[PDB]
Amino acid sequence: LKLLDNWDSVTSTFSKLREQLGPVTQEFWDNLEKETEGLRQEMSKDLEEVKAKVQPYLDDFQKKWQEEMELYRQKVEPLRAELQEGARQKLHELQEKLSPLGEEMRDRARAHVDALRTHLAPYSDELRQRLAARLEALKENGGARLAEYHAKATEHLSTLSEKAKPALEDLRQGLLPVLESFKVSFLSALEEYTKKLN
Amino acid sequence: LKLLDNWDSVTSTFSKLREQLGPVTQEFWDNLEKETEGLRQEMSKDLEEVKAKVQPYLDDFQKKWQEEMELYRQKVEPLRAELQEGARQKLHELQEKLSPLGEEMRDRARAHVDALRTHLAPYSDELRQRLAARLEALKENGGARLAEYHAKATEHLSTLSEKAKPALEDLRQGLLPVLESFKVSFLSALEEYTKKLN
Amino acid sequence: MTEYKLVVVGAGGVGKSALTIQLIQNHFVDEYDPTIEDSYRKQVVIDGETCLLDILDTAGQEEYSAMRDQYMRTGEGFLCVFAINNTKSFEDIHHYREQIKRVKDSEDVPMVLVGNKCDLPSRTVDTKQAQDLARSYGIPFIETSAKTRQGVDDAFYTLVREIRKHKEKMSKDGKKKKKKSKTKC
Amino acid sequence: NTIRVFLPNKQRTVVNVRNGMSLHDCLMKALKVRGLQPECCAVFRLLQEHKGKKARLDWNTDAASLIGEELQVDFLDHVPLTTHNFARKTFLKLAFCDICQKFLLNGFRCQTCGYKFHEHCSTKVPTMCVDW
Ligand SMILES: CCCCCCCC/C=C\CCCCCCCC(=O)OC[C@H](COP(=O)(O)OCC[N+](C)(C)C)OC(=O)CCCCCCC/C=C\CCCCCCCC
Ligand SMILES: CCCCCCCC/C=C\CCCCCCCC(=O)OC[C@H](COP(=O)(O)OCC[N+](C)(C)C)OC(=O)CCCCCCC/C=C\CCCCCCCC
Ligand SMILES: CCCCCCCC/C=C\CCCCCCCC(=O)OC[C@H](COP(=O)(O)OCC[N+](C)(C)C)OC(=O)CCCCCCC/C=C\CCCCCCCC
Ligand SMILES: CCCCCCCC/C=C\CCCCCCCC(=O)OC[C@H](COP(=O)(O)OCC[N+](C)(C)C)OC(=O)CCCCCCC/C=C\CCCCCCCC
Ligand SMILES: CCCCCCCC/C=C\CCCCCCCC(=O)OC[C@H](COP(=O)(O)OCC[N+](C)(C)C)OC(=O)CCCCCCC/C=C\CCCCCCCC
Ligand SMILES: CCCCCCCC/C=C\CCCCCCCC(=O)OC[C@H](COP(=O)(O)OCC[N+](C)(C)C)OC(=O)CCCCCCC/C=C\CCCCCCCC
Ligand SMILES: CCCCCCCC/C=C\CCCCCCCC(=O)OC[C@H](COP(=O)(O)OCC[N+](C)(C)C)OC(=O)CCCCCCC/C=C\CCCCCCCC
Ligand SMILES: CCCCCCCC/C=C\CCCCCCCC(=O)OC[C@H](COP(=O)(O)OCC[N+](C)(C)C)OC(=O)CCCCCCC/C=C\CCCCCCCC
Ligand SMILES: CCCCCCCC/C=C\CCCCCCCC(=O)OC[C@H](COP(=O)(O)OCC[N+](C)(C)C)OC(=O)CCCCCCC/C=C\CCCCCCCC
Ligand SMILES: CCCCCCCC/C=C\CCCCCCCC(=O)OC[C@H](COP(=O)(O)OCC[N+](C)(C)C)OC(=O)CCCCCCC/C=C\CCCCCCCC
Ligand SMILES: CCCCCCCC/C=C\CCCCCCCC(=O)OC[C@H](COP(=O)(O)OC[C@H](N)C(=O)O)OC(=O)CCCCCCC/C=C\CCCCCCCC
Ligand SMILES: Nc1nc2c(ncn2[C@@H]2O[C@H](COP(=O)(O)OP(=O)(O)NP(=O)(O)O)[C@@H](O)[C@H]2O)c(=O)[nH]1
Ligand SMILES: [Zn+2]
Ligand SMILES: [Zn+2]
């Protein structure tokens, strides 16, 4: 009933707002027409003058831009020549170093790797020896560890049986009556929700 | 209430846990001994070999460091001198550009700004007149809108009170018996809940 | 996810609804049933991304409707489907084209000419006829048939391709009087 | 005389009824094109002042009496509305996730919706892939 009662007031509000909306749109549009027309009148000023004045404006800018480009073109040629001739020398000096220093670095790299290779030869074998020594130790100790781990796991499993059988039974024997007690309170609660909220 | 029963079960698990912990830690400590001593058998040779390998490894690396260091002295140093030369050349090239083109760019900027002084400034003055007429219309329509808003405010206020009066009255006269009903629901709800959760 | 508004138009009996049913539902029809307002939706992953095709079917048997003008304005891609076994549909293409121009308030919109029932031996309209007319308007023409279901999948994709180019072309133009309007990617 | 026929998800098929066509009569047409069963379907009319429940009608209800009204059919046979489907399969092309910033290789995707998410993303998104 309350919904319909309050809705009736909302309906009247909508009606009054709609009745008022009429004049409102008329008044708003009336002023809007002054704004639109004002902008239309000013269009023969804003747009018109910007169209007429854009001629000498863009002409000046375009002309200066052309001059700028002309100057840039007249500069880019000698400057590119300088850049070319300069780069030729700059790269030449680099090449004059890339050959000797490059070959030298290559030969030095050979020695760098050679020294490492000569050192890595015994080291790699020793590393394998070390790994073998570790693997063997970890194999014997690991076997003992696993055997003991299995034993511990078996003992934990045996004690786990005390949880799977007695403890679980105790839990079951405890939960059974509790569930019944909880069901009663649950059922009675369900009634409450159908008594107060209905 | 039957928590005392479950407590005993929890105690049983804890008791058995201690019965496990004892033997477990005893053998785990022996296990740790196998591990510690075993790992030490590897670490002993490891450490000894570490010194025996790091010493020549450092020497080998030092040799390579010296090699590269001397190489950087015969490569980087000269390359730096030539880099400076190339930089000096480029700086000269840049100077010979930043001077003529520098004054030219500023000159272009002068031509741009001088144009803007007669492009933007005068146009802004015209914009002042246009904006004045625009704001004038906004003030004219604004004045009308002020009257509209005030009138609409009265029309809205009259309709507001027109509905607020009967609404508040019906709300109060509606909530009155409803609150009384709520009391009936609440009282019965609380009473029953106190019995369920007793 | 990408959303594409697809509105189809055509004369009553061009197999407009048949193409849709045999495309999305993959079902064949027999009895003619005038369609007034139908719409199919599918979240397809074209090229990987999730694209939702919002297809809207129209009534082939109808004159002018205010409601049509409304929802047809909210469309992006338009498919000009007609039956090549009937010259009537070929002529109606112009009317439907002009109608869209007014509704969309533009002279250039994403439209694709589709010649349905092309597998039928009742070929009244020749491919060259429609293709030449389409080429002189700047629209693509694809032959299809709801009976054979060949090219239907790509026909709808072709429209999306037009839409994607339309938005791109628009950003590179700005709705101006540009003679040169050939740009892509 | 236009009747707004709405189907599950967001499908709409306004047909032309005349003379005397009941809801079952109109649905008989769609049933053959859709290829489904009206057994798990129920006819619900437009929400007429309610908090959020669809009012069920009858199969013999005349469509002419619902002119301009929106009549939607829903699956009232155990769980109504379009639910999210959990299916695991590949995609048509490698795309990005809609939940995380990565590529979608092999995750989960719905049939009714069609979202793109990873296996972890299944419960990573608190929003359903149901669009309006
Ligand atoms: C149980 C550990 C006890 C540790 C203490 C006792 C140790 C006793 C001695 C040894 C213990 C060894 C335990 C080894 C466990 C291996 C688990 C594992 O490798 O499993 C692998 C499987 C793999 O996949 P799948 O083959 O299953 O599927 C495949 C589906 N297809 C085919 C589509 C392919 O995955 C699985 O098995 C899923 C396994 C899920 C296990 C959940 C255990 C939850 C228990 C407690 C949670 C809280 C722990 C911390 C409590 C702190 C309290 C303060
Ligand atoms: C967060 C709070 C915001 C509060 C309000 C102010 C926000 C200011 C922040 C950013 C400025 C946003 C300006 C939006 C202008 C309208 C955009 C619009 O409505 O787009 C509508 C179109 C409609 O569909 P379509 O088919 O025509 O376009 C298809 C896509 N398409 C463009 C590339 C072909 O959708 C599209 O454009 C595609 C989507 C992208 C559209 C970009 C339009 C850019 C236009 C102007 C940029 C702003 C210039 C002024 C900056 C002043 C800074 C002080
Ligand atoms: C009476 C006085 C009135 C004064 C009115 C002043 C305002 C006027 C407003 C609009 C009028 C625009 C008129 C434009 C006229 C030129 C149109 C045009 O032709 O222009 C083309 C360019 C380039 O085009 P193209 O390279 O394709 O062709 C290039 C072809 N060839 C190589 C020949 C180079 O393009 C462009 O000028 C487009 C430039 C704008 C791009 C907007 C992109 C917006 C996208 C996203 C918005 C993000 C907003 C973020 C906000 C928050 C930020 C923190
Ligand atoms: C906790 C114990 C109660 C406490 C008091 C009430 C608290 C309510 C708060 C949240 C409500 C959550 C449950 C909403 C269930 C909406 C069901 C619905 O579906 O309802 C219809 C709408 C419209 O479609 P339909 O009727 O054709 O489908 C009907 C499908 N079926 C029959 C499943 C009914 O479903 C749709 O729109 C689909 C999209 C979701 C629409 C949700 C509409 C929820 C309605 C009211 C919730 C907000 C109330 C307060 C609003 C204050 C505003 C200032
Ligand atoms: C004025 C507007 C206010 C809006 C915000 C209200 C916030 C209220 C306070 C907390 C709630 C926040 C989250 C509200 C989410 C509303 C979602 C919704 O609008 O749903 C609308 C739908 C409408 O009907 P449909 O046929 O489209 O949906 C059918 C769904 N189907 C398949 C069950 C039956 O109705 C349904 O979704 C039915 C419910 C579906 C989801 C059930 C989830 C149950 C599991 C956990 C719920 C946890 C809730 C928060 C607990 C906080 C504890 C501190
Ligand atoms: C869930 C509970 C409710 C949560 C509500 C809040 C949102 C929650 C959802 C996410 C949290 C986001 C938190 C903030 C960080 C993420 C923001 C975001 O949104 O992450 C997604 C967006 C959109 O995805 P995407 O495709 O871009 O990334 C694609 C990336 N990939 C290449 C993999 C696939 O990432 C981007 O936006 C980046 C690229 C676009 C950048 C545009 C910048 C424009 C700058 C100025 C223009 C301003 C215009 C203002 C007016 C706009 C009018 C329309
Ligand atoms: C001082 C403390 C510093 C702490 C630093 C470390 C923590 C920093 C916190 C956050 C790191 C955020 C890193 C950036 C994440 C970007 C995620 C993203 O870029 O995502 C993009 C996708 C895009 O998708 P799309 O483009 O295909 O669709 C449309 C997307 N669009 C609408 C933009 C239109 O969208 C999505 O991933 C969102 C999809 C929906 C996800 C719903 C998730 C709901 C669960 C939780 C909501 C959490 C909201 C937190 C809001 C925080 C506000 C401050
Ligand atoms: C403690 C253990 C940590 C383990 C690692 C955790 C994650 C962070 C680890 C490292 C940081 C970098 C991770 C980079 C992962 C890349 C995965 C990937 O391969 O993605 C590939 C996808 C798909 O291929 P595509 O799109 O490249 O090619 C598309 C086709 N084609 C190439 C033509 C381009 O593309 C993409 O995912 C692009 C995704 C772009 C957005 C990435 C946003 C990342 C957000 C945060 C940074 C990570 C924060 C981690 C915080 C950890 C806290 C514990
Ligand atoms: C435990 C507490 C209670 C929990 C109760 C259960 C969970 C809550 C219950 C219900 C969930 C309610 C979620 C409400 C928000 C949902 C947001 C969302 O809708 O999620 C999904 C969207 C998907 O979007 P879609 O486009 O794929 O589909 C769009 C589909 N449609 C049309 C219909 C929108 O996600 C998106 O839209 C992406 C939006 C990305 C927006 C990025 C905004 C970035 C802006 C600022 C970020 C600044 C970050 C600064 C650095 C720090 C950042 C932290
Ligand atoms: C208009 C722009 C104003 C901009 C002002 C300035 C700032 C702008 C800032 C960012 C610009 C955002 C621009 C967004 C443009 C799109 C808006 C929109 O997309 O407008 C409609 C959508 C729904 O479109 P639709 O789905 O038909 O998709 C239609 C498209 N298509 C087919 C994928 C899915 O609007 C929505 O998506 C709303 C979310 C609907 C979510 C539905 C699913 C909800 C799921 C769970 C509910 C959980 C509730 C938990 C409790 C909440 C309590 C509060
Ligand atoms: C009459 C009921 C009829 C049925 C009603 C059903 C619906 C019930 C729903 C709502 C009704 C109750 C509505 C209660 C609203 C309580 C609102 C409230 O008090 O907010 C503040 C309290 C403050 O707690 P405290 O002062 O302990 O902590 C303050 C904090 N340390 C600080 O000061 O910084 O926050 C807390 O107490 C939260 C932690 C409490 C810890 C102690 C919690 C103690 C709880 C119970 C005490 C033991 C009960 C044992 C069993 C008795 C029955 C057999
Ligand atoms: N052989 C053949 N039959 C077709 C083809 N296209 C449509 N049809 C058939 O023509 C009949 C009506 O199809 P339909 O799509 O309803 O025609 P329509 O022009 O869309 N009518 P409307 O616009 O009112 O829905 C059906 O039998 C349909 O299968 C086609 O390409 N080849
Ligand atoms: Zn993901
Ligand atoms: Zn989904």
Side-chain angles (χ1 to χ4, degrees), chain C residues 149-163:
Chain C
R149 224 282 202 182
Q150 179 181 327
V152 191
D153 237 87
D154 203 84
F156 283 74
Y157 297 167
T158 301
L159 182 65
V160 182
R161 298 167 187 141
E162 294 288 298
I163 302 169

Side-chain angles (χ1 to χ4, degrees), chain B:
Chain B
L1 295 320
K2 302 145 72 93
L3 298 179
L4 313 177
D5 276 275
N6 179 257
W7 257 115
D8 195 36
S9 335
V10 175
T11 309
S12 302
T13 10
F14 283 175
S15 305
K16 283 296 168 189
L17 282 176
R18 300 186 185 141
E19 288 171 37
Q20 281 162 90
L21 289 174
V24 162
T25 44
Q26 286 162 28
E27 54 179 293
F28 188 67
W29 265 40
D30 178 64
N31 168 87
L32 277 175
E33 279 179 18
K34 296 192 196 74
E35 301 189 297
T36 45
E37 298 303 289
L39 292 172
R40 272 151 202 174
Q41 293 172 330
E42 319 171 306
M43 283 310 295
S44 52
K45 275 201 60 67
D46 204 292
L47 279 170
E48 300 307 86
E49 286 196 20
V50 157
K51 313 155 186 176
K53 276 186 261 300
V54 164
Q55 279 165 27
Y57 183 68
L58 265 174
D59 166 79
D60 175 87
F61 230 132
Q62 276 151 27
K63 281 164 172 157
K64 248 172 299 304
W65 274 324
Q66 289 170 30
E67 281 188 83
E68 230 77 287
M69 231 181 300
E70 299 190 72
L71 290 178
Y72 286 157
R73 289 177 180 153
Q74 296 181 31
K75 289 188 176 73
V76 182
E77 294 210 73
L79 280 173
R80 155 190 272 156
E82 284 144 76
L83 200 154
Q84 288 164 331
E85 224 72 272
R88 287 159 181 169
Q89 287 276 33
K90 199 172 189 178
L91 282 171
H92 201 150
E93 290 163 52
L94 294 174
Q95 272 181 326
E96 297 197 281
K97 289 166 185 61
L98 285 166
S99 308
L101 284 164
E103 299 277 286
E104 195 176 283
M105 286 304 295
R106 284 181 177 136
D107 184 62
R108 297 165 182 225
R110 293 174 208 133
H112 274 218
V113 177
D114 206 44
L116 298 174
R117 289 167 183 144
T118 331
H119 284 195
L120 295 178
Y123 196 77
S124 309
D125 197 49
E126 306 174 299
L127 278 176
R128 287 167 180 151
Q129 294 176 207
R130 299 179 204 164
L131 288 178
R134 220 148 300 185
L135 294 184
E136 185 185 86
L138 289 178
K139 271 182 286 163
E140 209 66 273
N141 297 343
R145 281 177 178 124
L146 280 171
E148 285 153 48
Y149 273 130
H150 271 234
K152 257 96 270 269
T154 315
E155 294 187 82
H156 186 78
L157 187 76
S158 46
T159 37
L160 254 180
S161 35
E162 178 200 282
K163 243 70 271 181
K165 289 194 173 186
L168 284 172
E169 287 307 279
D170 252 306
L171 276 174
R172 288 173 181 150
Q173 294 182 331
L175 290 174
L176 277 158
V178 110
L179 281 181
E180 293 312 318
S181 307
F182 264 121
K183 292 172 186 175
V184 181
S185 343
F186 280 127
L187 288 177
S188 314
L190 296 172
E191 277 191 27
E192 296 234 59
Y193 271 129
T194 312
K195 290 193 172 192
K196 267 75 192 188
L197 303 175
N198 197 270

Side-chain angles (χ1 to χ4, degrees), chain A:
Chain A
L1 296 174
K2 185 189 179 292
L3 280 179
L4 297 175
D5 176 62
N6 288 156
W7 181 69
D8 175 73
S9 324
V10 182
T11 303
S12 17
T13 304
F14 272 136
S15 307
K16 297 304 266 271
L17 286 177
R18 280 174 173 186
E19 285 170 54
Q20 178 65 223
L21 246 175
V24 164
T25 35
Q26 290 176 210
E27 296 159 330
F28 255 93
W29 259 243
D30 184 68
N31 289 325
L32 274 177
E33 277 301 79
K34 300 157 189 171
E35 253 137 55
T36 50
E37 250 233 26
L39 293 165
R40 280 168 183 152
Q41 298 156 27
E42 292 204 67
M43 184 185 294
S44 312
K45 298 186 178 295
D46 245 344
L47 247 176
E48 277 295 272
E49 292 165 48
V50 89
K51 269 185 168 190
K53 299 178 75 144
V54 87
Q55 305 162 31
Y57 280 18
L58 288 186
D59 167 76
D60 189 55
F61 265 75
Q62 202 191 34
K63 204 172 299 146
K64 281 162 180 171
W65 238 83
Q66 286 172 31
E67 292 184 38
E68 285 199 67
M69 274 309 305
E70 280 235 288
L71 286 163
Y72 268 165
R73 288 178 195 126
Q74 285 233 266
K75 258 88 178 183
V76 75
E77 309 187 298
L79 302 191
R80 189 154 290 175
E82 291 176 347
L83 284 171
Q84 266 178 25
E85 290 183 73
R88 286 170 189 172
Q89 214 208 275
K90 291 155 191 169
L91 292 174
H92 212 252
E93 264 80 84
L94 290 173
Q95 284 166 28
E96 287 300 90
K97 293 311 181 78
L98 282 175
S99 330
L101 302 178
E103 274 216 76
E104 175 188 276
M105 205 60 179
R106 288 173 192 203
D107 196 57
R108 273 291 162 186
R110 296 169 182 147
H112 288 356
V113 179
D114 188 77
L116 268 180
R117 195 195 313 111
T118 313
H119 272 114
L120 282 178
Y123 297 170
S124 44
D125 180 77
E126 267 159 46
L127 285 178
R128 295 174 211 130
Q129 292 192 32
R130 293 170 124 241
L131 284 173
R134 285 191 174 262
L135 285 178
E136 289 182 87
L138 289 180
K139 218 170 189 180
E140 303 182 334
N141 166 265
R145 277 195 297 204
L146 283 191
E148 259 190 29
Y149 265 40
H150 287 334
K152 299 175 227 286
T154 307
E155 293 319 303
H156 286 313
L157 223 162
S158 304
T159 33
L160 173 69
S161 310
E162 300 289 274
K163 307 174 192 178
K165 303 173 178 183
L168 232 171
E169 177 187 80
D170 163 75
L171 285 170
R172 280 168 157 202
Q173 286 173 326
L175 287 175
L176 290 184
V178 163
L179 293 173
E180 298 193 279
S181 312
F182 219 80
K183 277 184 183 182
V184 176
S185 29
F186 220 112
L187 289 168
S188 37
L190 292 169
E191 292 183 292
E192 298 306 326
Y193 294 119
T194 327
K195 276 184 295 177
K196 280 69 186 175
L197 299 174
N198 171 34

Side-chain angles (χ1 to χ4, degrees), chain D residues 96-97 101-102 126-127:
Chain D
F96 288 101
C97 187
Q101 308 175 270
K102 216 167 200 68
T127 2

Side-chain angles (χ1 to χ4, degrees), chain C:
Chain C
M1 75 277 298
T2 359
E3 186 193 41
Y4 290 102
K5 301 303 195 188
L6 313 176
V7 182
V8 290
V9 272
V14 299
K16 179 165 49 53
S17 312
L19 282 181
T20 358
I21 298 191
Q22 187 54 85
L23 174 80
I24 304 299
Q25 305 300 324
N26 288 329
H27 210 60
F28 207 85
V29 296
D30 175 53
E31 65 275 72
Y32 184 90
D33 190 64
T35 318
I36 304 178
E37 194 193 281
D38 185 41
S39 302
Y40 283 173
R41 181 243 63 159
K42 202 179 179 193
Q43 224 154 272
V44 295
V45 286
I46 298 178
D47 197 37
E49 57 176 55
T50 332
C51 307
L52 194 145
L53 305 176
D54 186 32
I55 312 172
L56 164 69
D57 193 10
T58 46
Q61 300 181 329
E62 185 167 73
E63 308 162 78
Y64 194 94
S65 24
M67 286 298 299
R68 184 184 296 228
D69 209 276
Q70 178 212 89
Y71 56 64
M72 193 162 57
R73 204 176 304 165
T74 339
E76 305 182 287
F78 308 101
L79 281 176
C80 323
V81 293
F82 75 100
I84 68 159
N85 72 328
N86 186 15
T87 12
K88 177 85 179 77
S89 3
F90 187 66
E91 315 170 303
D92 276 314
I93 288 305
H94 204 111
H95 187 219
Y96 291 135
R97 182 243 198 189
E98 292 308 296
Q99 191 175 148
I100 297 174
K101 279 167 60 189
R102 175 193 54 76
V103 181
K104 284 294 287 180
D105 201 57
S106 291
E107 302 184 302
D108 171 73
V109 281
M111 288 180 308
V112 180
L113 198 61
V114 179
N116 198 39
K117 306 185 193 175
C118 72
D119 90 275
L120 297 186
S122 329
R123 280 195 173 248
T124 323
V125 192
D126 174 58
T127 324
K128 184 186 177 299
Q129 302 186 271
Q131 266 198 266
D132 210 58
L133 188 69
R135 203 59 183 167
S136 311
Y137 279 140
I139 51 166
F141 173 68
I142 303 295
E143 279 202 350
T144 333
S145 161
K147 178 197 156 209
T148 12
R149 224 282 202 182
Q150 179 181 327
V152 191
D153 237 87
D154 203 84
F156 283 74
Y157 297 167
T158 301
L159 182 65
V160 182
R161 298 167 187 141
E162 294 288 298
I163 302 169
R164 285 186 167 183
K165 292 180 300 181
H166 193 258
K167 302 185 184 299
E168 192 195 288
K169 162 186 55 181
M170 270 299 90
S171 309
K172 293 168 169 179
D173 188 273
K175 285 286 193 185
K176 295 293 178 68
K177 193 176 183 162
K178 281 161 62 273
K179 188 191 179 72
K180 180 55 82 66
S181 305
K182 198 61 182 174
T183 177
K184 191 203 173 308
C185 178

